[PDB]
Amino acid sequence: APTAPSIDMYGSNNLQFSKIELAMETTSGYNDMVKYHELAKIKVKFNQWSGTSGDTYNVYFDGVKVATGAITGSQTTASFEYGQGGLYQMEIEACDATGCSKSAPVEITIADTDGSHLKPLTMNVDPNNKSYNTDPSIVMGTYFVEWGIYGRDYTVDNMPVDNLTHILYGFIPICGPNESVKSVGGNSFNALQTACRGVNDYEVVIHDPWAAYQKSFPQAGHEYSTPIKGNYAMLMALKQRNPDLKIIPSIGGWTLSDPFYDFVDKKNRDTFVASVKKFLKTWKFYDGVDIDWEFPGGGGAAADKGDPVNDGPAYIALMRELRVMLDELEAETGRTYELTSAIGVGYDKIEDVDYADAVQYMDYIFAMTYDFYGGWNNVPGHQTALYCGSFMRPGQCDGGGVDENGEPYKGPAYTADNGIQLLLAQGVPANKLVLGTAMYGRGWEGVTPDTLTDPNDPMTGTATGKLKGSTAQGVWEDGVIDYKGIKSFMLGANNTGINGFEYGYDAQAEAPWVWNRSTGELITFDDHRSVLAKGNYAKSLGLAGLFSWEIDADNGDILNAMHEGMA
Ligand SMILES: S=C=Nc1ccc2oc(C3=NCCN3)cc2c1
Numbered sequence: 001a002p003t004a005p006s007i008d009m010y011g012s013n014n015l016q017f018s019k020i021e022l023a024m025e026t027t028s029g030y031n032d033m034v035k036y037h038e039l040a041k042i043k044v045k046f047n048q049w050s051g052t053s054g055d056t057y058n059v060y061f062d063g064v065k066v067a068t069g070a071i072t073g074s075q076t077t078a079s080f081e082y083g084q085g086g087l088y089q090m091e092i093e094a095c096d097a098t099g100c101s102k103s104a105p106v107e108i109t110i111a112d113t114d115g116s117h118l119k120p121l122t123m124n125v126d127p128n129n130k131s132y133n134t135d136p137s138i139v140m141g142t143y144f145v146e147w148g149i150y151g152r153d154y155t156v157d158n159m160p161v162d163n164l165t166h167i168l169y170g171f172i173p174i175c176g177p178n179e180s181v182k183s184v185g186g187n188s189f190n191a192l193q194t195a196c197r198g199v200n201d202y203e204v205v206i207h208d209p210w211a212a213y214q215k216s217f218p219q220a221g222h223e224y225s226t227p228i229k230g231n232y233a234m235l236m237a238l239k240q241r242n243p244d245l246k247i248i249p250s251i252g253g254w255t256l257s258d259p260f261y262d263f264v265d266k267k268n269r270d271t272f273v274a275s276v277k278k279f280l281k282t283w284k285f286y287d288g289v290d291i292d293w294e295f296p297g298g299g300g301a302a303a304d305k306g307d308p309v310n311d312g313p314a315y316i317a318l319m320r321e322l323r324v325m326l327d328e329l330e331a332e333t334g335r336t337y338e339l340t341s342a343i344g345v346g347y348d349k350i351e352d353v354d355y356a357d358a359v360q361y362m363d364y365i366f367a368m369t370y371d372f373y374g375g376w377n378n379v380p381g382h383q384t385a386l387y388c389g390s391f392m393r394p395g396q397c398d399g400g401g402v403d404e405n406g407e408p409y410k411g412p413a414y415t416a417d418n419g420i421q422l423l424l425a426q427g428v429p430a431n432k433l434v435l436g437t438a439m440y441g442r443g444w445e446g447v448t449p450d451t452l453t454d455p456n457d458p459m460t461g462t463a464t465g466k467l468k469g470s471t472a473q474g475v476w477e478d479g480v481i482d483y484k485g486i487k488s489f490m491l492g493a494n495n496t497g498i499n500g501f502e503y504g505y506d507a508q509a510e511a512p513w514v515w516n517r518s519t520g521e522l523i524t525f526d527d528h529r530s531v532l533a534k535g536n537y538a539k540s541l542g543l544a545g546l547f548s549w550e551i552d553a554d555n556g557d558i559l560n561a562m563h564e565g566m567a
């Protein structure tokens, strides 16, 4: 009949323990900040200040004895190891010759990176996002960007998760040559250089540990002693709410592609593949890997990079090696892992890889059917059009014509259909292709009525520079504006144009635009109409479905249209 133990919370780290040890107050190399243990160390302090303390204690989780040891006077520390993540009701019993006595139960948290210790996330979704009964075999994907939590103020609990089958999390960098990241800013390059200290070149790391697992999100119940926080803890809780959702890390993108060019050497591919396997064993909520190399053959952010002879065979070899590694994981865990890639769809990008060969290893190809035209130059055009628009010259659609200076075109025009047709012509199966939608516009200023060669079509005009505006209007970088900013400040509630803009739509291209004839501002984007057209196209060709880039920029209209388009 010893006295029942009483739990010392503060000395028991508030009963928060974890299989993964994460630095919370400092920033260093990835292998200094993140250490995954097969067993969590549990240390619970209890006291017995009254009566007799007894000789031995037992610790129970949900009524099952998990530890035992000696009672040490009026305060005792039970230290033991535990391998299974979860939330458990713990009791501590003190025993002697004359009987045993149990503490009142208390919840203990043993964190693991599948979210097994988390309750389902509470969502805060804009109610403009509607509910649909889309066939569950259709891909409905979007990219969520790690940095959406700063200015854009868009967190995981804001995502319309019931309307998504795949969440691609952007972007995981590869250690090594990454000068392109300095175009984003020196802090972002410095963050990568910090993460890579003590890490071999060609291994993956987390670019922004603050956003990924350190930041406390009060909306997710996070507190000081919460063992995993950040977007990653939210994605874990999201998987608990939506256990069929696939969450896939996307490696690469525009500014993080420079190390992929070194994958012509197999040793570098080996290093990378092993590192991905270790990342997925560490962060168990992820369901696969998405390779976003921009672009094999060159044409990406680094003008000096690209080997059109060797990059495509390296890309195929990489996908083969990834699929072998992921089959090893499947065997170890009993889970299914998906292998996917986002690829350029200009004819010059498609010609540099045999995707029919690479795609036999892949579940899905995400065709980047956007960014065809944009503020990097002063040539307006439809950035995400399905077909050739009205502005194109004779012979431009197919590539056999000359431009307005007399220079021959070198290939078929940039349109989503020209890209899809080229990939199907290679032998890529329709049912592995996912068509992309932009949730943003690209834009110019100075396209005035006197620059147009066809007065009904501002895409035949000439710009003087990139669209400018404030972050309040959804302009986070010159030349680019969020769809929700176009809707609020350029379309208005009737979709006919406000603030001096008029809405236009190229019914042949299937591409909308807004134009302010006073300022020459012209923006090319995707809207309800063009997305319904993309969905109709995807249905008619037996494509796998649709994905969008990037979800924080939508107000619900684009994802709703994607569902309606596939109905
Ligand atoms: S493309 C690229 N887009 C990016 C990439 C990284 C970024 O970091 C921030 C940021 N600003 C203050 C704290 N963090 C914005 C931002 C935009």
Ligand SMILES: S=C=Nc1ccc2oc(C3=NCCN3)cc2c1
Binding pocket: 253, 254, 255, 371, 376
């Ligand atoms: S994140 C990303 N942002 C992007 C995504 C695609 C892009 O393409 C260009 C471009 N520059 C010259 C020809 N094309 C810039 C650029 C930035």
